[PDB]
């Protein structure tokens, strides 16, 4: 209902609580070449040696991922210089917090 | 785990994370927001409620004159948020997906 | 230096200190708390300090105070 | 080939979740340790505060949001002319229930009597549109005449 | 399309998108932003312009006393934007690159 | 004989498609209900007929 | 090999365009349904709508 002279104003309010869930970190994992690709046998390690330097790249990438996950979970939370503690007595003007 | 796959435990255990979250909540509930800039101060919770209403275009007279009533809604709000997670399992979707 | 064997018991490896992330040799476990230097895992990490040796300990969540 | 494909997939997914970690850090810095005026950032509506909670590989917030309720509508006017000069509200909206004029704040019904304390003048009432005729009470004359 | 490739149509058609855009424009033009928080209130355009000026550090007296003029420019600006796209084709570059 | 590759490929493509649908749903649909303009237009001289 | 390369390229471009989608969502929520005081975010100068 719009017109050049009409203003609506609320007379009451309600307090609501809304939630939202955010991921932070994955599961730090690692895989080793020679145990996986080869059956713990020299007859396979010797052949894989001919292929050069791939496993260094793979292990470096996985280690980088793990370090990044640790840095993420450190950065999201530890934003306060020191740990505080609540007083034993609870007096918050009727507000209930023991949940 | 047998073939070649290994998993490394996280650096910070769950207890430490809970301790940080408790510290943040304790700072917010009493110190207000001064501890986010420098040293932690202290101020009653009702005054902080007044100073938060003062930031969205309403004066202090709205809060104090209805203060008791306001508390009820907040409590009732939490009184619902448990039930919203007491039985429904579709709220936690992103974590399960990951 | 100190050597960490990950996820394997020191009952069959060949001043040891069994930990959650594995078990390590070459270091001694003190009871004090200090800021972490070389992270190992599971809240346990080591550093080099006073003669001088490598010592591993539980992490300290900064200082503590009340309001 | 299989191992390389797995590594590539893990790389992409971790690079994706880095963004969620950054977003959570920004929300923790803004919503919690202060009040953020960005609309639809900390809760749906006018924001009050937040409480963080841990979760397995994740974080869960509790945005406390202020939301208006049932409303009533009235007749408005952008200005009031009293002695030829205009009179604008210092901070608020002019409103009237059809008989007596009032000035109120923009987010809660609270009528007040028109007074020079919360009004400032700017020019005469000939250029502004929608101007209406009324009177402005002076709070100093009554104690002028109290003597 | 013949060999092995297929394309799926989008879930939301163009007319529904236009309907959402029209609804957003109508809400912005005839309600301010009260519908952005809760229920949609109603308020004329003149004092909405007045408050938007008040939001950057100029009093209301700037708007009303020049209101008529403030209209003309806003029309003429739109009267230019069409000519800014009626012939020039380099403006819509990014979408082409998509 | 090559095992499970096409399952991975189809899963990736389906994930991409669903992500695009979610993106185009999230960018626009932020209003609870559809409004409509009044038939008469009196906006204090402002022109919106384009 | 060719199919895997094509899939990887599509994955990267989709991951890129997700950021533009998020930026557009933020601009729609801030610039439209209110007024944003972030300088050089919604318009070049002081923002109105
Ligand atoms: C504003 O709304 C609240 C509730 O939304 C009203 O409080 C109710 O008041 C009635 C009558 O006293 C009670 O029966 C209800 O139990 C109250 N509700 C709650 C949640 O406490 C309040 O009266 C309203 N105020 C105005 C001015 O309308
Ligand atoms: C917050 O609300 C809870 C829920 O009512 C209160 O816990 C109850 O306390 C009473 C008396 O202390 C017990 O008889 C109930 O059994 C408790 N309910 C439980 C444990 O579910 C709590 O006391 C309230 N806190 C404050 C500060 O008022
Ligand atoms: C907004 O401006 C347009 C452009 O001038 C107006 O459309 C013109 O209206 C007049 C009178 O109805 C017609 O004679 C012209 O042919 C229209 N122009 C075009 C290009 O169609 C429109 O009326 C204006 N909106 C108002 C005044 O509300
Ligand atoms: C290590 O060996 C000891 C010897 O009894 C045993 O008690 C303990 O459970 C073992 N720990 C692990 C992780 O195998
Ligand atoms: C302190 O360290 C000594 C040395 O290992 C140890 O025997 C003792 O149990 C420790 N005390 C506590 C309380 O941990
Ligand atoms: C107030 O709004 C209602 C609908 O919400 C409408 O029917 C009524 O006419 C309005 N009152 C005035 C005075 O415009
Ligand atoms: C309008 O409000 C005034 C405030 O006292 C009151 O005296 C008057 O009767 C009201 N008029 C109507 C029509 O409600
Ligand atoms: C509002 O519109 C009506 C419709 O004709 C008009 O009579 C009235 O003068 C307008 N009010 C103002 C303040 O322009
Ligand atoms: C307001 O009052 C003045 C002087 O009494 C008069 O000239 C003018 O026409 C009046 N305007 C209205 C809208 O009543």
PDB file of C-alpha atoms in Angstrom, chain B residues 17 21 24-25 28 33 35 45 49 52-53 55-56 58-59 74 95, chain D residues 28 32-35 46-49 51 54-57 66 105 107:
ATOM      1  CA  UNK B  17      39.613 -25.822  21.083  1.00  0.00           C
ATOM      2  CA  UNK B  21      35.862 -21.101  22.695  1.00  0.00           C
ATOM      3  CA  UNK B  24      36.111 -16.111  23.812  1.00  0.00           C
ATOM      4  CA  UNK B  25      32.647 -16.506  25.329  1.00  0.00           C
ATOM      5  CA  UNK B  28      32.395 -11.399  25.235  1.00  0.00           C
ATOM      6  CA  UNK B  33      34.439  -5.641  23.210  1.00  0.00           C
ATOM      7  CA  UNK B  35      39.508  -6.820  24.805  1.00  0.00           C
ATOM      8  CA  UNK B  45      25.866  -6.882  30.915  1.00  0.00           C
ATOM      9  CA  UNK B  49      22.904  -4.390  25.994  1.00  0.00           C
ATOM     10  CA  UNK B  52      24.389  -2.435  21.518  1.00  0.00           C
ATOM     11  CA  UNK B  53      20.853  -1.099  21.091  1.00  0.00           C
ATOM     12  CA  UNK B  55      24.112   1.196  17.576  1.00  0.00           C
ATOM     13  CA  UNK B  56      21.027   0.349  15.492  1.00  0.00           C
ATOM     14  CA  UNK B  58      17.090   3.081  19.135  1.00  0.00           C
ATOM     15  CA  UNK B  59      17.680   4.901  22.403  1.00  0.00           C
ATOM     16  CA  UNK B  74      16.393 -14.662  24.899  1.00  0.00           C
ATOM     17  CA  UNK B  95      30.312 -31.297   7.719  1.00  0.00           C
TER      18      UNK B  95
ATOM     19  CA  UNK D  28      34.780 -14.429  14.025  1.00  0.00           C
ATOM     20  CA  UNK D  32      32.020 -11.541  17.837  1.00  0.00           C
ATOM     21  CA  UNK D  33      34.523  -8.865  18.907  1.00  0.00           C
ATOM     22  CA  UNK D  34      32.220  -5.977  18.071  1.00  0.00           C
ATOM     23  CA  UNK D  35      29.116  -5.159  16.068  1.00  0.00           C
ATOM     24  CA  UNK D  46      19.739  -5.954  12.610  1.00  0.00           C
ATOM     25  CA  UNK D  47      22.656  -7.618  14.375  1.00  0.00           C
ATOM     26  CA  UNK D  48      23.228  -7.717  18.135  1.00  0.00           C
ATOM     27  CA  UNK D  49      25.979 -10.275  18.901  1.00  0.00           C
ATOM     28  CA  UNK D  51      28.454 -16.771  20.351  1.00  0.00           C
ATOM     29  CA  UNK D  54      33.150 -25.742  18.286  1.00  0.00           C
ATOM     30  CA  UNK D  55      32.187 -28.773  16.214  1.00  0.00           C
ATOM     31  CA  UNK D  56      34.091 -31.698  14.673  1.00  0.00           C
ATOM     32  CA  UNK D  57      36.044 -30.058  11.845  1.00  0.00           C
ATOM     33  CA  UNK D  66      16.704  -8.002  16.427  1.00  0.00           C
ATOM     34  CA  UNK D 105      12.257   7.661  15.828  1.00  0.00           C
ATOM     35  CA  UNK D 107      12.349   2.014  14.414  1.00  0.00           C
TER      36      UNK D 107
END
